[PDB]
User: What shape does this take?
Amino acid sequence: PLMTDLSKKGYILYDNVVTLPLTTFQQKISKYFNSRLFGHDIESFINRHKKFANVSDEYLQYIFIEDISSP
Amino acid sequence: PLMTDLSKKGYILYDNVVTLPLTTFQQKISKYFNSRLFGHDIESFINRHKKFANVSDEYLQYIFIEDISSP
Assistant: This one.
């Protein structure tokens, strides 16, 4: 139920389904680990885990802890 | 404890790890490095032992004991 307040944290909700844009996730995770040394790991992880609910709607059934931790 | 002389040489300690610039590293080994002769051999050294913080930052976990002694 807290997706309502989660969407107010700079998040976008589509069709009442948690949507994970690819570029935002890649840019956010690129600031923590080296891209060159982990690109194959990232692509292998996403290829075997990604799921799309539409032709263009692609999301990951994963939620971080920082974006949901209360301040 | 060698920070007294390391700082005088213009080097900086990053994450308690000595930093050696790549450009000045290649300056001394210009005669000892050749693309046609030593490039393939030096690649196995570079990829195996040299580690970088990111794409831009470069450092080596080694120092020249003979090159730091005052003549």
In short: Residues 52 and 58 of chain B are 5 Å apart (CA to CA). The first strand of chain B starts at residue 13 and ends at 14.
